Design a protein around this ligand. Sequence first.
Ligand code: HEM
Ligand SMILES: CC(C)Cc1c(-c2ccccc2)ncn1CCCn1ccnc1
Length: 214
Amino acid sequence: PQDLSEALKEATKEVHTQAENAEFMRNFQKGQVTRDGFKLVMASLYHIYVALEEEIERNKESPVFAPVYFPEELHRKAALEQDLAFWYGPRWQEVIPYTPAMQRYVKRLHEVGRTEPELLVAHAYTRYLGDLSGGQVLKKIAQKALDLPSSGEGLAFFTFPNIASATKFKQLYRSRMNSLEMTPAVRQRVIEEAKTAFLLNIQLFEELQELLTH
Ligand code: HEM
Ligand SMILES: CC(C)Cc1c(-c2ccccc2)ncn1CCCn1ccnc1
């Protein structure tokens, strides 16, 4: 396509279906998710957003990222901190898991942010835009399966408080992505990096499924 935002969505549709088809996500969508499983997703997201937001901050003034720098609207670390205190309790920093598949994702995020910052947008796309389109329904499934007490915490990750409308913010984000100027080579690399991002998630999903089924 012309617009990078369209080119990304089109080019990742297949891997996106793979992610939807992953065994752990299938169980999820079918409402079969356990607290143990959900804890692992929350832990994974924490390590992922820590590293991504670290690298966004390192690159916030770079011409290859600045147009999609939206820290107040999108930042997820503090929400995940809140959520992990609930899921893992007061000592969550000492007890949350940090698995090999989580590390592999984090390592690629840091590699991209430090040495290939022009691809960071692929990672921010894969995560943030995903989160905006999807939080709604998967959250509801979670609440049903998990049957939380009404303790007012645990799911802050799924609310972006600084975005009034996800639809309008997603159009704005697409617009800014489409304003990035890149050579055809960089653009091919950005697309490929998004596929890589999806694969990192899929591999993580494969690992969590393994860890939970012994
Ligand atoms: C690894 C997990 C996933 C990632 C990284 C991911 C990522 C994304 C991304 C980046 C988008 C934005 C597409 C665009 O507008 O350009 C998106 C949209 C979407 N995702 Fe996901 N997703 C994942 C899992 C799922 C699952 C499990 C479902 C449903 C069960 C789902 C349903 C959707 C839907 C319905 C859209 C919106 C389609 C549209 O408006 O055009 N995704 N996802
Ligand atoms: C339950 C949910 C958080 C699963 C998920 C992950 C995930 C990744 C890595 C580890 C754990 C979970 N990434 C995206 N999702 C779907 C929610 C966002 N979305 C995207 C498109 N439609 C919705």
